[PDB]
Symmetry: D2
Amino acid sequence: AEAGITGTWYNQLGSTFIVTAGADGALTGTYESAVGNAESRYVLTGRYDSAPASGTALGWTVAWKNNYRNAHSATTWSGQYVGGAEARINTQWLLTSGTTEANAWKSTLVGHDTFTKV
Amino acid sequence: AGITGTWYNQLGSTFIVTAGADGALTGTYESAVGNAESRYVLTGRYDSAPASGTALGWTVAWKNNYRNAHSATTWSGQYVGGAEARINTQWLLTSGTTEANAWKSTLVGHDTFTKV
Amino acid sequence: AGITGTWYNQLGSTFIVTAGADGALTGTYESAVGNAESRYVLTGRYDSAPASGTALGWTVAWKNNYRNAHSATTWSGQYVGGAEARINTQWLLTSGTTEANAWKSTLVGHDTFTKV
Amino acid sequence: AEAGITGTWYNQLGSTFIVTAGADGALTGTYESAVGNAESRYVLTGRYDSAPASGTALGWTVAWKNNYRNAHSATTWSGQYVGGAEARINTQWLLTSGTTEANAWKSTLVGHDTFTKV
Ligand SMILES: O=C(O)c1ccccc1/N=N/c1ccc(O)c2ccccc12
Ligand SMILES: O=C(O)c1ccccc1/N=N/c1ccc(O)c2ccccc12
Ligand SMILES: O=C(O)c1ccccc1/N=N/c1ccc(O)c2ccccc12
Ligand SMILES: O=C(O)c1ccccc1/N=N/c1ccc(O)c2ccccc12
């Protein structure tokens, strides 16, 4: 929940996700990545189910552009928050890169990330 | 400017968005499926300084004042401007589930948005 | 019968398949992309006793007598027969990579096959 | 390789994959599933890179129909074989169910399976 989700998380790559869950279902924070043509932090925005039933559905987006670099790509993570002892966020993600129309067919990667809460 | 406006997917859903100078996407989404009749809030990000399509994404949690589906969809794609502007995406829809049903909680698909 | 035949995707690739009574799919795929000019073997499965589309899938490893891309694509979808028959799919393309590049080894997409 | 891939594997759900890798790049075997509207074994067919460079690219399909049941669906696994001490097959999969044209938009699931060799 609000409290549940809010905090600092890390994924299997060593990436850092700092998030605040608002009462209106908003997610806002920053993402600090370990891989790609990256550097420094990036702004994230998302939504979550503020009135869950076991898991809490959520998703967020990161556009890989900050004041220092631009990779012309964006990633969206879709998954669920599972509270308890070992609170975790289990996700599947899609990374799309800006391409020409000829290359569009191979513009999207798919993967999975597991986040653990500090 | 180009992204800002009203769009529609193949299902007939309506995506009304405002693109900020800074890279933010804000707006509302009115579904023609799953089961709705109502609008939902959406939030996202986009490359505000593109190179040729413009990368973007947004999320919608399927909960409003009237109903709660306990699910969320994320769209990831690119905006291709011109005379016949389009937003080409691939999406992931995840439902809240018990751990036993977790293996099959996510659906994958593709949507094409146009201004008509 | 219906599935057996010659099909084409949006890229112009050619899919020649034979559907067995038993559920097997066998054939050849000639790519119009990535970078080819040549054919590759394909193998798959299909529901040989459908209920309304017919579920199927097949894999192509991108290695023939001439080249080796060290990759493979799997297509998963459904055949929808009628006057204007189609095969609607979603695909995964995985390249062999070092463990360090493993996170980004798979591309996702969608293809539509028709008889024209 | 042929020898590398050939054998018995299990995934995180307790499913069993028995496979034989042919010299011509063919994969043939049987799959025995722990989840779904399933029972008994099902035939699998696939292809793999018979002349790899680190990982070996491969993929296979299962149509969920045997002499005992039919769920009118098929799954395709795409991934790589990584040899060594802890030989594993890392995959991403797509499961499509036969549906009417109205429901086609929500006909496909996406997930990930990790196979360990006995
Ligand atoms: O970092 C993660 O945890 C991460 C997790 C899941 C998917 C992608 C990720 N990272 N993606 C990038 C990070 C930094 C960059 O400069 C990039 C440049 C181009 C494309 C992707 C990236
Ligand atoms: O609407 C689209 O254009 C749409 C486009 C892509 C993916 C999903 C979509 N819609 N999904 C739902 C809409 C309304 C609901 O109440 C739901 C309840 C449970 C799961 C999904 C939905
Ligand atoms: O051809 C299609 O219709 C096609 C359709 C969907 C997905 C992939 C495809 N083709 N992919 C390749 C074709 C030829 C190659 O040498 C490759 C080398 C590396 C990676 C992919 C390919
Ligand atoms: O079993 C795995 O390891 C498995 C792993 C990945 C994806 C799917 C799986 N299993 N899928 C089914 C198994 C048995 C069934 O009767 C089904 C009926 C309908 C849809 C899926 C299945």
